[PDB]
Amino acid sequence: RKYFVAANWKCNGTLESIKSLTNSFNNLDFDPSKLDVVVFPVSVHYDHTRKLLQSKFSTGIQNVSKFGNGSYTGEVSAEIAKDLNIEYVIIGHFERRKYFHETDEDVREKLQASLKNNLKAVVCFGESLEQREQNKTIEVITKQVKAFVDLIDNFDNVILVYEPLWAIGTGKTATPEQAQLVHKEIRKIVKDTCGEKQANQIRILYGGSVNTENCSSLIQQEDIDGFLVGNASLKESFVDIIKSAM
Amino acid sequence: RKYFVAANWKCNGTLESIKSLTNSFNNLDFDPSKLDVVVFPVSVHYDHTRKLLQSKFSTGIQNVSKFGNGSYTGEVSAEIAKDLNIEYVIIGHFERRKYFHETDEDVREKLQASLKNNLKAVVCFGESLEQREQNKTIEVITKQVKAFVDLIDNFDNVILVYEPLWAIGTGKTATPEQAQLVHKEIRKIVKDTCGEKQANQIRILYGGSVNTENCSSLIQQEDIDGFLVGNASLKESFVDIIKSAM
């Protein structure tokens, strides 16, 4: 299974910083048929970013609507994304679950709309610190995955991302070891409700704090197929995090 | 008062449909110093629409974040909008209050972030059918407007829009005389808290169902200064609606 490295620039950037950052990325020599590298810029920055990035890199958007075309002011539907040749979309990120009250049901409806319009999806989930302290991680993870697992028609087109909320912003850290354990568990859940061939071809990315110092330890875990990088993707050094996966 | 005519395309359009529509809009000869005409496309269609529309047309986006730059996956900040020279932003649209749970508190904060970044705002509000039947129209409209009006540092940069939810999708029809009554009262609220001079300079648009048959009878009302047009703005005949305000 092919490694996946994604850059989530979130709500950051200017036309200038993006011109400056895309040039550094373009200097990276890599074969896109042996590694997937995706960049997710702010929606209004999309065209500009797609024009500055060489086709080596794939591009997507940070969110997509659960509804289709219609009277939904401010939403970007999956068909609109499809019409523009936007290949990937991020769904269920915890900032969207937290600041904007997206539920597991919004996650599944968005995943369905995306698959219906032939877009590839990056689905996020993970447990909070309160839930981990109560030894409930597996119960919470299985509930979040069950909400949408039955829609995956092609296990190459849907990528899973585990976000260890308990270790995000709490002033706690995750050891690659503690991450690999959850990934293994997630893969077992996919094996048991979808099949063995499906479980072994689907990528499960680590979605915690990833930098140039620990990216090598994480990728080397058999069940960690890459990452969804936040802050560190806003720096030129991000080319180093991509090298570790090749 | 300069009339204001806005096309809210909501979540609609393709590259080819927009190319064909902008072409048609560009054929209408109007003077921007005497009439404001703004079109709001989907975020990912913005650059494309801005390049196709002649500079006499103003453009904006359908929603902004209440947060600034940072870890807010999927949001677009006022600050990013400023860097791209995006002139207008829609705030408080009923579809976002309904489907995405945005509150008066949210509206207030998005307006504050918008004004701090030199963006002009179209602020929406209005009562529902249930509220209108209990004879609470004024009470509701007063509370919604009072949630943000003290922020208006400048009465040419903020536009108010009354949306009669009670007639949007219920089978009721709002008549010009009925809309005028509410517009007159909206202007009184502004008079009572900002000054009489301020109240006579701010534009209050009607955001109910507008078309080529009823536009002239609405714009002709003394307290109605234009409209936020929904689906009629996805047609070529939209030019006829702009004309009614010339």
SS3 string, chain B, reads CCEEEEEECCECCCHHHHHHHHHHHHCCCCCCCCEEEEEECCHHHHHHHHHHCCCCCEEEECCCCCCCCECCCCCCCHHHHHHCCCCEEEECCHHHHHHCCCCHHHHHHHHHHHHHCCCEEEEEECCCHHHHHCCCHHHHHHHHHHCCHHHCCCCCCEEEEECCHHHCCCCCCCCHHHHHHHHHHHHHHHHHHHCHHHHHHCCEEECCCCCCCCHHHHHCCCCCCEEEECHHHHCCCHHHHHHCCC
Burial of residue A138 (number of CB atoms within 10 Å: 0-12, 13-18, 19+): middle
Q: What is the token pair recorded at B137?
A: 């129209």
A129 is in an annotated binding site: no
Structure tokens at A86: 């936007």
Q: Which residue is closest to A169 within chain B, CA to CA? A: B71
Q: How far is CA A117 from CA A74, A162, B12, in A?
A: 19, 25, 15
Element (H, E) at A48: helix A46-52
Catalytic residues of B: 93, 163
Query: CATH assignment of B1-246, given 3.20.20.70, 3.40.190.10, 3.10.580.10, 3.60.20.10?
Result: 3.20.20.70
**Which chain B residues have a beta carbon less than 8 Å from that of A74?**
11, 43, 62-63, 90, 93, 95-96, 100
Tell me the residue type at B16. Answer: E
- The crossing angle, in degrees rounded to 10, of helices A137-146 and A176-194 is 40
Q: How far is B209 from chain A (nearest CA, A)?
A: 12
User: Are residues A96 and A63 in contact, defined by beta-carbon separation less than 8 angstroms?
Assistant: yes
Contacts of B208 in chain A (CB under 8 A): none
The experimental method is X-ray
Whether residue B78 contacts residue B89, with contact meaning beta carbons closer than 8 Å, is answered with yes
As given in the structure block, the two tokens for residue A170 are: 């709490």
> Is A231 annotated for ligand binding?
yes
Report d(CA B58, CA A220) in Å as an integer: 52
| DSSP one-letter code for A150 | G
Phi, psi of B21 (to 5 degrees): -80, -45
Q: Which residues of A touch B (CB under 8 A)?
A: 8, 10-15, 42-48, 61-63, 65, 67, 69-77, 80-81, 83-84, 86, 90, 93, 95-96, 99-101, 230-231
Resolution as reported, in Å: 2.4
Q: Rounded to whole angstroms, how far apart are CA atoms A126 and A106?
A: 16
> Is B8 assigned to a binding site?
yes
Q: Annotate A193-223 with b (16+ C-beta within 10 A) or e (fewer).
A: eeeeebbeebbbbbbbbbeeebbeebbebeb
> CA of B100: which chain A residue's CA is closest?
A100
Tell me the CA distances in angstroms from A95 to A125, A164, A172, B71, B75, one per residue in order. 11, 13, 18, 7, 10
CA distance B59 to chain A (A): 13
Q: Tell me the chain A residues in contact with residue B100 when contact means C-beta distances shorter than 8 Å.
A: 74, 100
Pairwise CA distance, residues B2 & B200, whole Å: 11
Inter-chain contact A83–B14, Cβ cutoff 8 Å? yes
Mutant choice from B9, B20, B44 vs A, greatest count of A C-beta within 10 A: B44
**Rounded Cα distance, A13 and A20, in Å:** 11
CA B2 to chain centroid, in Å, comes to 15
